[PDB]
Amino acid sequence: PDQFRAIIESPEGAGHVGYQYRRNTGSTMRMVSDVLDERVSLWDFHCDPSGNVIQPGPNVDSRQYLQAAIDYVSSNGGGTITIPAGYTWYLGSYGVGGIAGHSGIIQLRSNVNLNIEGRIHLSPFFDLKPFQVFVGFDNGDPASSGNLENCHIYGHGVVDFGGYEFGASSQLRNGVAFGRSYNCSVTGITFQNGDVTWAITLGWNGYGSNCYVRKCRFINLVNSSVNAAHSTVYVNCPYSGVESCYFSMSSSFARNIACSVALHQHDTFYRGSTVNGYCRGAYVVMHAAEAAGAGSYAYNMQVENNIAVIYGQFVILGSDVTATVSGHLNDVIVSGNIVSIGERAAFSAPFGAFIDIGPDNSGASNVQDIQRVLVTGNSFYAPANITDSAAITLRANLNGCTFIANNFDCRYMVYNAPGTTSPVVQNLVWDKSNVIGGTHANQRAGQNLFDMQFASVVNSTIEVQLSCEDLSMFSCILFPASCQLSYSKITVDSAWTKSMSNTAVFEGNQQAGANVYVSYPATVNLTSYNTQGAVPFFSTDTNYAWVTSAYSLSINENLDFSPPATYTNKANGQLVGVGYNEIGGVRSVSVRLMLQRQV
Amino acid sequence: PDQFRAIIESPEGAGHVGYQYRRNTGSTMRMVSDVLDERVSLWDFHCDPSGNVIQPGPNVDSRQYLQAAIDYVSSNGGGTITIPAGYTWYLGSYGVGGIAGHSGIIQLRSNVNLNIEGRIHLSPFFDLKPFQVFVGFDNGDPASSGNLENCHIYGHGVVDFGGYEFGASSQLRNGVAFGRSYNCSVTGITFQNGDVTWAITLGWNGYGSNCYVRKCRFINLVNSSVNAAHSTVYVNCPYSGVESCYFSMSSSFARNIACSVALHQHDTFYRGSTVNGYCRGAYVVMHAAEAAGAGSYAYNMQVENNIAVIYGQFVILGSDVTATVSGHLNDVIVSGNIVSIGERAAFSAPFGAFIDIGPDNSGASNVQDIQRVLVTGNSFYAPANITDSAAITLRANLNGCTFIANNFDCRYMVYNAPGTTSPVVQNLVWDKSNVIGGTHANQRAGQNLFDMQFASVVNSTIEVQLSCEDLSMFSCILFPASCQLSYSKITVDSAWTKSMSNTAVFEGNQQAGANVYVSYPATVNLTSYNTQGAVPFFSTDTNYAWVTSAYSLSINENLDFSPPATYTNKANGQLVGVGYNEIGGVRSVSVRLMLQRQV
Amino acid sequence: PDQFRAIIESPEGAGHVGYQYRRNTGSTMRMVSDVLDERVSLWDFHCDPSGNVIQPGPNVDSRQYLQAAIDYVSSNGGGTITIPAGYTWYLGSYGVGGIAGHSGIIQLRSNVNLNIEGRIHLSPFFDLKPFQVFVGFDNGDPASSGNLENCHIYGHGVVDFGGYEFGASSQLRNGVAFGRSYNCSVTGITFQNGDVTWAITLGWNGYGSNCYVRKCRFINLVNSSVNAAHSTVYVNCPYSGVESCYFSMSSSFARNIACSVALHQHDTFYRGSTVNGYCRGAYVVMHAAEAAGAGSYAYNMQVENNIAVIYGQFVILGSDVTATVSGHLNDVIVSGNIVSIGERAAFSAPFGAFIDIGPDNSGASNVQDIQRVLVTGNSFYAPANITDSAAITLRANLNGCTFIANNFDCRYMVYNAPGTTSPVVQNLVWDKSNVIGGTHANQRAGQNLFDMQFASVVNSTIEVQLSCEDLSMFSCILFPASCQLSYSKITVDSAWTKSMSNTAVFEGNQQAGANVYVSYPATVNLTSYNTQGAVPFFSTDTNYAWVTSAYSLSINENLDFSPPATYTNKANGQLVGVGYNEIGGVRSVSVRLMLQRQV
Ligand SMILES: CC(=O)N[C@H]1[C@H](O[C@@H]2[C@@H](O)[C@@H](O)O[C@H](CO)[C@@H]2O[C@H]2O[C@H](CO[C@@H]3O[C@@H](C)[C@H](O)[C@@H](O)[C@H]3O)[C@@H](O)[C@H](O)[C@H]2O)O[C@H](CO)[C@@H](O)[C@@H]1O
Ligand SMILES: CC(=O)N[C@H]1[C@H](O[C@@H]2[C@@H](O)[C@@H](O)O[C@H](CO)[C@@H]2O[C@H]2O[C@H](CO[C@@H]3O[C@@H](C)[C@H](O)[C@@H](O)[C@H]3O)[C@@H](O)[C@H](O)[C@H]2O)O[C@H](CO)[C@@H](O)[C@@H]1O
Ligand SMILES: CC(=O)N[C@H]1[C@H](O[C@@H]2[C@@H](O)[C@@H](O)O[C@H](CO)[C@@H]2O[C@H]2O[C@H](CO[C@@H]3O[C@@H](C)[C@H](O)[C@@H](O)[C@H]3O)[C@@H](O)[C@H](O)[C@H]2O)O[C@H](CO)[C@@H](O)[C@@H]1O
Ligand code: NA
Ligand code: NA
Ligand code: NA
Ligand code: NA
Ligand code: NA
Ligand code: NA
């Protein structure tokens, strides 16, 4: 009996109290401790050396206790540790061993899930220092790390980075680095109040698979001029992605340095998410330096059905090389997104764009291999004052990109800055079903809507269709004489162009190329012979040697004659057609024509 | 020892039985009560004044017990209360205090989540009365309410409204009113068997953020002629939305009064959901009267990837004004939806439409500021008998809407009823990539496919492309003389139009406008001069003064001559072109031409 | 007192230890056993006849214990049974009763959910045998089965099929057969390591509703030449679907026999998922033999926003008949998908296709009723060597399908094999906004890009637009003389076609049909009369009786004359137009023209 009371009050007491489920005589005859052992929480490890529970709080460092919990549950083949609601659990020191090379705080372990219902905060020990809060590598050298498998972080709780600024731009900070990560995920968690490099990284240089970030919130994760750069989620393993997340920043620095997602391996996605306050939406990039685990190609890349207010570029495409590996990007889709450039002064943030074809990290524009991209069914808007806004800023070599059935309402459609890079362009396709908005009408003095500042263009299609007038623009499309143009189709629909001085401009007369197919409106002065009856009209100018046919876009105010409805050319570069003189006489008219070459 | 047995059997007994997790000597030395205190259920509060548990059932009012649970868990900083599976928990009285002004039953509190695994039912005390089952306001006046934060309702359970009808049309009923709600959500729950105004409302007049409804079912939530109106989810805070839900109604009244979602603030979405039996899919509206918390603009509005069978309109756009605030709607995307009008008689429910540009609640059509809308990649079908079916019913002023790459298979493409409203239309863009289906071929006697019953149209594009014949229709597009038309492009592709009497009709001869760009087929009678050789042909009629060129759509059955291939006009309004008389003689022909103006 | 110690140590002991939540005097005075009874796990039933717990393992058959758990929890109105983490639970025998007719192992029951956190494995008793692991039918004859309602399987755990091959091709294997299933779902689970027919089936012949598969992984579920066929999820009830799943196969047999999803009833969807290694993406089919529970029509079918690498066809459409029922498929949308054919030899797997219009299970091509399909905003790629790759393989009767704003980069656009089936085609619409890629340029000797090997085509549109040259192809579009063509529009844009010998080919001269609307480029030899001045030019050939107009696509190298810009025809089939001889003389020229008929 003394024994008994003593046993009951001891830590083995629950192990002596019997239990059978719902008094079911067919159920297991268990002890209370067995049922309690089905679950586990931080309270089961958050104790002093004598076993007495310790209350969390800002003067208590919870790190060792949470690590002890993870270590133990790992030793039993896994389970889910609850981080209890109603408390804030502070972290106040660095971890040890394999995660120390990563500035790690907690080491994650395979099959050990964290159900974060309460709050995890960083103590001021971390102020001005690097850190990665949760780390799944088990070695300081990621190349020598084991894998992290089957690790899920989820719940209604919060990771709060304490508001601390970076101490130096060279520092790195992260929330969750899953490492070489297979079937890992973060769901439901709010990451907030920091100055960090990433909130979550998935994978390592292509090693990993099936990692996801779903229904998470990321709020105010950049706050200082020290922060070098930020991507809220960096996706560095295949078959992985981000869905239904919320990203918000409020700091000015974020408008210049921060991106919501980086998709950096094949079969990755970003969908259904909302972004506000960031410079950039998503990078879609194959870095050769990251090609170890899944190959040198980033393919099956999906950015779909997002909502964004950004200050720089929505999707940024890239690929690059190292001394021994070449990176390639292909088979991309960008669809269903509704994006705007937020209110800002012209040139006050990185050049506004829906798609950017960006140079590598060294600024090289001649290393890229980007092709088979489909941009369809998106909307883009930039306010009228934002000069630096484009459907595409095409700033590095491009091996193909297709635009179908978008609505682009910004300053430029196609842009690259002159005297910068001279990209080599192939297979740029701009379908006629792209709707060009009117917000920037009257703002385009001196500017070309499609400003083709490239080394060369081949196998490309630009079908310009206006939907309102903008007589301020210099031209709808312009090719400098430095840009070769071949095996291409360039058209300017005549609607809303009657009063334009210039429609398409070929400063090197490139439209004469053998395999160039063009059409655009022009005004032409003609003069007829004096004969009564069928009578020829000829252009006064001789710069139509390339024209295969032309037709009238003008009415004929005359009763006594009519100019030709249609024209062809002559060897001397004049247009010629047969009109009709009811009464004879030399006629002189100025007519608006659709000039056509091989179309 | 007596002490001991007594202590063990008392409510403090579990607090005396020790426990250590898995017999781990490094774990906390706890008591059983500590581990049990990690969770909480309704059973912990569902007791009489002596502490004896009460069984739920239809004669027991569970309200006070659930409120006591919520109140207590709130006092500890939050947690999750389980509503146990295997039981039905009846609610049978109104709450008290701040929620009484809202006819509230339960008051939600911040950080207190409800895991509803069992069923919550309404008792007949609520029959013929108003109610809001869960309310997150803390004050009868929402303007004086505190916020509700971090409150999630989730699980496999059910909210059942008892089937009771409304007592009066002026009454309001709701499931969950989150109030001024920040990071709140409903997930997994079935709402069923009612006559209610809303199932869920998010936010209050723009106050709130990050509220969501995900994987919920709403079944049979309207059942009587008393019910004034119904929106299953009303989204009245930004950065919030509905995803992957199921909405079904079976009552006839629902086909006339019910909508699945209302998106009423910026950065809101409705996606991936299935609707059956409703009048309407979604409202997308900025009410000036709701502009307090997030501004006067509804922007970044997304309706994507839904499946619907409805009886009225799929998406309804609106904006309005108050005495001192003006509401604006812009930057909308409607994409990927597959929608039909369900089987019904013509005119038996509100006018069928994929998009409706609706007048305000007073019927005013001259207050709206709706622009920058993209409608792309959707399908719409209405059965052939449904006269009242349109791609767009454009019934109020429109400042822009773009249609690209849709498939519309219904009676009308563009419609507004004559002698009703006379909307002022700008920037209506109907791209040629919109496919017009053939289900209503042969049903269109007396009707215009695009019936342009507007005050005016400017900066608009209508590119009509048929894909089968319908010789029953009066015209492909018709503008009454009352409609001004300027700075617009209107084309009718000739395919399937050879036998149409009328293609495009301009009852005020508006196609002559200086900045109108048109083309469409017409039949024209011509007569030539008698001269052998090149010889002119002239139209007998003189109503072609606006024509810039025309070309043959007809073969020439003759050997001895040919009419011109192409024509222009003369000051008197005749067409003229130069054909060829192999042998002389006056010729008279009737030819099908493509008439072109400035295109 | 002896009593007392004995009571405490007995299975009723926890039922004597009091508990009150957090020492709250307003809370229920309960016993520990009451709180423990709020949850249930397999441990509560996994015991020998004396009540002693049994450890799971490969020599222990857990089946009877899990069934006993499900049976008991069912008897209390439901709940959720946990399958504990950290253990592998082996199944080693067949179930009994109603599921034996289905080779069932476990019988699911209404309102009883399974939270699978650990692993469920099949023991080698099942090697070479049929099985269905979880079965929701309650009768061997599904027609006589009751329903399964409100049953959810979810968690981070795993179902492992043991790697065992099928014993015979006629055998069936499944993971979860929900049966006649209403509000059932599988979420989060990994199904792996098998040779099975299905992983999950939803519904039975249209009976069921609201069943879903979300965030599941299916890995390596086909492994042998014995396996007849495989669909990873078969959706056989309405208002149901698959979202955000991952499907991977590695076996060669899978490339020939396996499909990820089968959508077989109305209001069903497949979205946001990633597929690798399969033959097929999704079937979308109405089998008449499955029409009992939800009617004879499959409508509101959605395949959207998926990523796939497959070896055969992405979406396969079908409908068929039985002796007394006819199946119909309509109102389908296929949007936003990014798909490729994986690296393979030509003809090494089933014919590669984005859409296939497939014959019934007997090979009949004359039973189908498929219409109102929208295919928009997708990308498709096949490597250049894959001869057997098409945007659409149209192999059975088609009543309509619309393609808008896709990017197809493969060998064929439209294909059917000659001398096979002769489908009857109506309402095939290929919009000009479909972008035709260049990967297969130079590979197309002897081949037609659009190979119209049909019995007949009516009410169809083919608007061919190239975006690069491919002079290897025989023609852009070809109709054999056996194919009737009427009430259709067929155009070939001239861009990149100057050097093509053949553009459009009508081997039966079908383009002359009264209601055929065509245009395409051709080279034509002309000769003029000798007259100075306006002078006629006539084609030497007489096969242009069908031409309504033609215009020049060639420049005029001459100074002394010009050919006509535009032409019409004469009764003898010559073209004729009026050019200009500055000086007289008979002229002879060869010109590239755009030939037009009724356009
Ligand atoms: C090529 C490369 O190292 N890739 C890293 C990736 O690095 C990014 C880089 O691609 C670019 O976007 O600039 C940012 C700026 O922050 C990153 O570079 C910075 O970080 C890397 C990686 O840090 C090292 O490796 C981590 C795995 C360790 O945890 C960390 O302690 C550190 O040793 C560094 O090498 C650069 O010098 C530094 O400028 O980042 C992703 C995501 O973390 C990673 O998966 C990839 O390997
Ligand atoms: C302008 C406005 O009041 N907005 C309310 C919104 O009201 C809708 C209204 O926009 C329109 O759609 O008609 C319906 C018909 O039911 C609603 O009007 C009805 O309800 C409102 C709101 O009810 C008041 O305010 C609630 C917050 C309280 O809980 C309730 O007790 C009541 O005091 C009412 O003022 C109208 O007179 C009545 O006709 O409804 C949404 C969603 O509830 C709300 O967020 C918004 O403020
Ligand atoms: C018409 C039909 O039976 N439909 C079944 C469906 O059957 C598919 C069939 O549509 C086609 O796709 O071939 C596969 C090849 O595996 C299936 O046929 C095979 O299975 C069926 C169904 O199996 C019977 O019915 C199940 C409900 C029982 O559980 C099972 O024990 C068996 O009695 C069979 O009749 C065929 O002979 C066999 O070749 O399969 C789906 C999904 O299971 C089902 O819902 C539908 O009724
Ligand atoms: Na490091
Ligand atoms: Na150059
Ligand atoms: Na009120
Ligand atoms: Na008017
Ligand atoms: Na069977
Ligand atoms: Na035939």
Tab-separated table of N, CA and C in Angstrom, chain C residues 259 261-265 268-270 281-287 298-303 314-319 328-334 355-358 370 373:
chain	number	residue	atom	x	y	z
C	259	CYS	N	-2.714	5.625	-66.927
C	259	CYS	CA	-3.294	6.941	-66.943
C	259	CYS	C	-3.403	7.479	-65.535
C	261	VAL	N	-5.693	9.897	-64.204
C	261	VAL	CA	-7.049	10.118	-63.742
C	261	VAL	C	-8.017	9.683	-64.834
C	262	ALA	N	-9.228	9.259	-64.448
C	262	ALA	CA	-10.340	8.983	-65.300
C	262	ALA	C	-11.520	9.786	-64.767
C	263	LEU	N	-12.011	10.767	-65.528
C	263	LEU	CA	-13.206	11.513	-65.133
C	263	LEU	C	-14.384	10.952	-65.911
C	264	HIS	N	-15.357	10.345	-65.232
C	264	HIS	CA	-16.362	9.550	-65.861
C	264	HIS	C	-17.803	9.934	-65.527
C	265	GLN	N	-17.996	11.065	-64.832
C	265	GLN	CA	-19.321	11.613	-64.519
C	265	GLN	C	-19.236	13.136	-64.511
C	268	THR	N	-17.002	17.067	-62.723
C	268	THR	CA	-15.772	16.512	-62.190
C	268	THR	C	-14.573	17.228	-62.736
C	269	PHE	N	-13.491	17.192	-61.973
C	269	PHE	CA	-12.317	17.955	-62.277
C	269	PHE	C	-11.029	17.280	-61.950
C	270	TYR	N	-9.970	17.753	-62.603
C	270	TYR	CA	-8.595	17.337	-62.394
C	270	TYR	C	-7.741	18.550	-62.523
C	281	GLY	N	-2.616	11.200	-69.399
C	281	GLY	CA	-2.979	12.159	-68.371
C	281	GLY	C	-4.358	11.872	-67.804
C	282	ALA	N	-5.380	12.103	-68.570
C	282	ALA	CA	-6.723	11.899	-68.105
C	282	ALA	C	-7.641	11.384	-69.174
C	283	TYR	N	-8.472	10.394	-68.902
C	283	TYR	CA	-9.624	10.131	-69.673
C	283	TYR	C	-10.796	10.995	-69.224
C	284	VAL	N	-11.565	11.489	-70.200
C	284	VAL	CA	-12.800	12.212	-69.933
C	284	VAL	C	-13.821	11.538	-70.802
C	285	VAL	N	-14.660	10.715	-70.188
C	285	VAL	CA	-15.444	9.673	-70.936
C	285	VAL	C	-16.832	9.547	-70.304
C	286	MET	N	-17.876	9.448	-71.119
C	286	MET	CA	-19.148	8.908	-70.646
C	286	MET	C	-19.380	7.514	-71.204
C	287	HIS	N	-19.175	6.503	-70.345
C	287	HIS	CA	-19.515	5.132	-70.686
C	287	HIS	C	-21.002	4.949	-70.403
C	298	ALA	N	-21.951	13.161	-69.484
C	298	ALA	CA	-20.825	13.685	-68.771
C	298	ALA	C	-20.646	15.139	-69.253
C	299	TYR	N	-20.888	16.109	-68.391
C	299	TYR	CA	-20.815	17.527	-68.696
C	299	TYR	C	-20.090	18.226	-67.571
C	300	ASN	N	-19.633	19.459	-67.818
C	300	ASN	CA	-18.879	20.209	-66.789
C	300	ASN	C	-17.673	19.415	-66.347
C	301	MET	N	-16.837	19.093	-67.314
C	301	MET	CA	-15.641	18.333	-67.107
C	301	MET	C	-14.447	19.250	-67.232
C	302	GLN	N	-13.586	19.303	-66.234
C	302	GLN	CA	-12.521	20.323	-66.163
C	302	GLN	C	-11.166	19.693	-65.988
C	303	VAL	N	-10.186	19.928	-66.867
C	303	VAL	CA	-8.834	19.489	-66.720
C	303	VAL	C	-7.962	20.733	-66.824
C	314	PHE	N	-2.484	13.088	-73.650
C	314	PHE	CA	-2.727	13.807	-72.454
C	314	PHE	C	-4.189	13.694	-72.019
C	315	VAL	N	-5.137	14.154	-72.806
C	315	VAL	CA	-6.574	14.028	-72.553
C	315	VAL	C	-7.166	13.187	-73.620
C	316	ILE	N	-7.968	12.182	-73.251
C	316	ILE	CA	-8.626	11.282	-74.130
C	316	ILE	C	-10.122	11.456	-73.903
C	317	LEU	N	-10.858	11.845	-74.941
C	317	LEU	CA	-12.294	12.014	-74.916
C	317	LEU	C	-12.997	10.792	-75.481
C	318	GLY	N	-14.137	10.461	-74.896
C	318	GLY	CA	-14.936	9.335	-75.361
C	318	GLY	C	-16.384	9.397	-74.899
C	319	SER	N	-17.203	8.711	-75.691
C	319	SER	CA	-18.539	8.359	-75.271
C	319	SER	C	-18.984	7.165	-76.080
C	328	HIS	N	-23.141	10.494	-73.650
C	328	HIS	CA	-22.867	11.769	-74.312
C	328	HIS	C	-21.862	12.559	-73.520
C	329	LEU	N	-20.930	13.235	-74.183
C	329	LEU	CA	-19.898	14.009	-73.509
C	329	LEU	C	-20.016	15.419	-74.071
C	330	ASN	N	-20.178	16.410	-73.189
C	330	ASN	CA	-20.230	17.802	-73.666
C	330	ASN	C	-19.873	18.739	-72.574
C	331	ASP	N	-19.513	19.961	-72.895
C	331	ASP	CA	-19.229	21.009	-71.914
C	331	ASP	C	-17.980	20.601	-71.116
C	332	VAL	N	-16.883	20.568	-71.833
C	332	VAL	CA	-15.579	20.205	-71.331
C	332	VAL	C	-14.649	21.399	-71.455
C	333	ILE	N	-13.725	21.583	-70.510
C	333	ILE	CA	-12.656	22.597	-70.655
C	333	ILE	C	-11.315	21.984	-70.277
C	334	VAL	N	-10.334	22.246	-71.109
C	334	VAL	CA	-8.988	21.767	-70.958
C	334	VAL	C	-8.111	22.999	-71.063
C	355	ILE	N	-4.743	16.022	-77.271
C	355	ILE	CA	-6.125	15.561	-77.207
C	355	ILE	C	-6.223	14.355	-78.113
C	356	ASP	N	-6.905	13.293	-77.660
C	356	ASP	CA	-7.265	12.189	-78.481
C	356	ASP	C	-8.764	12.022	-78.447
C	357	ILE	N	-9.356	11.845	-79.606
C	357	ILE	CA	-10.804	11.507	-79.766
C	357	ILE	C	-10.747	10.070	-80.081
C	358	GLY	N	-10.984	9.289	-79.027
C	358	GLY	CA	-10.685	7.852	-79.123
C	358	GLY	C	-11.950	7.052	-79.398
C	370	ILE	N	-19.621	13.648	-78.822
C	370	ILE	CA	-18.735	14.543	-78.101
C	370	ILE	C	-18.797	15.905	-78.702
C	373	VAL	N	-16.513	21.288	-76.458
C	373	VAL	CA	-15.266	21.151	-75.774
C	373	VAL	C	-14.427	22.387	-76.039
